[PDB]
Amino acid sequence: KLTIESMPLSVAEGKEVLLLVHNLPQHLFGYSWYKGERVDGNSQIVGYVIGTQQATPGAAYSGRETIYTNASLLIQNVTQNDIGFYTLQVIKSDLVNEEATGQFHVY
Amino acid sequence: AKLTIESMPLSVAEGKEVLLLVHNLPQHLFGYSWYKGERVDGNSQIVGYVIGTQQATPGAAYSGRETIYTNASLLIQNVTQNDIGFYTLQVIKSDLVNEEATGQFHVY
Ligand SMILES: [Cl-]
């Protein structure tokens, strides 16, 4: 069951947070990370194809975000206004796909 | 400032992956070099990475497990049970008065 863990859960403003991914399913084509709680193209940070290892930024990419090979997302220079919701869509090879949302708390 | 390395996570299940994050990079950098172990030593170099060109070149200690990112972070996959966990970053400044820092993780 796919879930997202924040390291750390509470993030000092301007510091960085790692979003770790637990329980990735098998037979994956790639990952997509979104700012906020929903899978929405206008809030996409990155699309990442595993086989090619090609990250392509989406309209929400700000320069702060880095995706890793294990699907983890590092966000640097976290802003005070950030509600902290980030959403991962796992794209399976059969396209019956899964999502999970995590959040951190800025102070 | 003071350059330091943080393991995400600090304790790593054997065969899983660990991210070495870098804190307090100085300014006016030419690149990064990552080493296996506690010392800057060519025989234990994983990668040399030039920032401007984004060119990573592997060193003799590159095993296939290690990937350097543009922010200096190093991701190590398939961590072995025997791994003592020490990894060392050398930051190469443009004036060559350089800095090092060592981090470690603990395999279980
Ligand atoms: Cl150059």
Distance CA(B97)–CA(A35), nearest Å, equals 40
Distance CA(A66)–CA(B11), nearest Å, equals 22
Long-range CB contacts (within 8 A, 24+) of A43-50? A45/A73, A45/A86, A46/A73
The answer to whether B20 and B6 have CB atoms below 8 angstroms apart is yes
A50: contact with B, CB 8 A cutoff: no
Chain A CB contacts of B75 below 8 Å: 68-70
Chain A CB contacts of B9 below 8 Å: 7, 20
Name the class of domain B1-108. Answer: mainly beta
Ligand 1 mean position to B46 CA, how many Å?
Answer: 19
Among chain B residues, the shortest Cα distance to A75 is held by: B71
Considering only residues 72 to 101 of chain B, which have any Cβ-Cβ distance to chain A shorter than 8 Å? Answer: 73, 75, 77
B8: contact with A, CB 8 A cutoff: yes
The answer to whether A60 and A43 have CB atoms below 8 angstroms apart is yes
SS3 B84: coil
Chain A CB contacts of B71 below 8 Å: 66, 74, 76
Q: Cis peptide before A8, with omega less than 30 degrees from 0?
A: yes
Nearest CA-CA partner of A53 in B40, B44, B69, B14: B69
Pairing of strands A85-92, A98-103: antiparallel
Nearest CA-CA partner of A29 in A52, A58, A45: A52
User: Which experimental method was this entry solved with?
Assistant: X-ray
Name the class of domain A1-107. Answer: mainly beta
Q: Chain A closest CA to B39's CA: distance in Å?
A: 26
B71: contact with A, CB 8 A cutoff: yes
Q: Which of A7, A69, A76 sits opposite B8 (nearest CB)?
A: A7
Task: Measure the CA dihedral A14/A15/A21/A22, to 10°.
Answer: -130
Among chain A residues, the shortest Cα distance to B70 is held by: A66
Nearest CA-CA partner of B4 in B72, B93, B65: B72
Q: Which of B8, B67, B70 sits opposite A18 (nearest CB)?
A: B8
A68: contact with B, CB 8 A cutoff: yes
Q: To one decimal place, what's the resolution in Å?
A: 2.4
A71 contact partners, CB below 8 Å, separation of at least 6: A21, A24, A31, A48, A88, A90
